Amino acid sequence: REGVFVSNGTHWFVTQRNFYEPQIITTDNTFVSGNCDVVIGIVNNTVYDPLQPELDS
Amino acid sequence: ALQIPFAMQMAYRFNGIGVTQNVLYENQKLIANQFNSAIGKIQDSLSSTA
Ligand SMILES: *[C@@H]1O[C@H](CO)[C@@H](O)[C@H](O)[C@H]1NC(C)=O
Ligand SMILES: *[C@@H]1O[C@H](CO)[C@@H](O)[C@H](O)[C@H]1NC(C)=O
Ligand SMILES: *[C@@H]1O[C@H](CO)[C@@H](O)[C@H](O)[C@H]1NC(C)=O
């Protein structure tokens, strides 16, 4: 939404662009558009959904 | 100078004019072809006339 995607070599994060503060990639930090195949250089990862722990109740 | 991939730099520059990042990445081949063609027009214009 407001950052850039980044990896430390093992894990994927989203950061603000002008200062390295990494955060978990989530459905709040990101927005969808369309299927994978349109985009050059897209990578597979998990995106965490903050409603899933509530559905785990 | 901080390196960044040129397609991601253009997605920041799109996001700076109020057009969402996915509009570049979904249309990247078209955007590159329009750019490559538009510099071809500049070269032909300057080559054609003094
Ligand atoms: C990447 O970040 C995670 C979470 O902080 C950490 O567990 C992992 O060891 C890091 N990898 C490297 C190569 O530092
Ligand atoms: C990055 O550059 C290498 C070397 O040209 C190329 O194999 C690779 O496909 C590029 N990465 C992407 C996202 O295409
Ligand atoms: C990403 O995941 C899909 C489905 O599992 C797979 O077909 C594709 O090859 C993966 N891409 C890469 C770069 O590994």
Ligand nearest to the CA of A44: 3
Technique used to solve these coordinates: cryo-EM
Distance separating alpha carbons of residues B38 and B34, to the nearest angstrom: 6
Choose among B11, B22, B2: nearest CA to A20. B2
User: In chain A, which residues have their Cβ closer than 8 Å to the Cβ of B8?
Assistant: 4
Distance separating alpha carbons of residues B35 and B29, to the nearest angstrom: 10
Helix (H) / strand (E) containing B16: helix B6-16
Task: Tell me if A47 sits within 8 A of A25, measured CB to CB.
Answer: yes
Ligand nearest to the CA of A7: 1
Ligand 1 mutation target, pool A7, A10, A13, A15, most atoms within 8 A of CB: A10
- For chain B, percent helix, then strand, then coil, each to nearest 5? 75, 0, 25
Structure-derived torsion over alpha carbons of residues B30, B32, B37, B38, reported in degrees to the nearest 10: 110
Nominal resolution (angstroms): 3.3
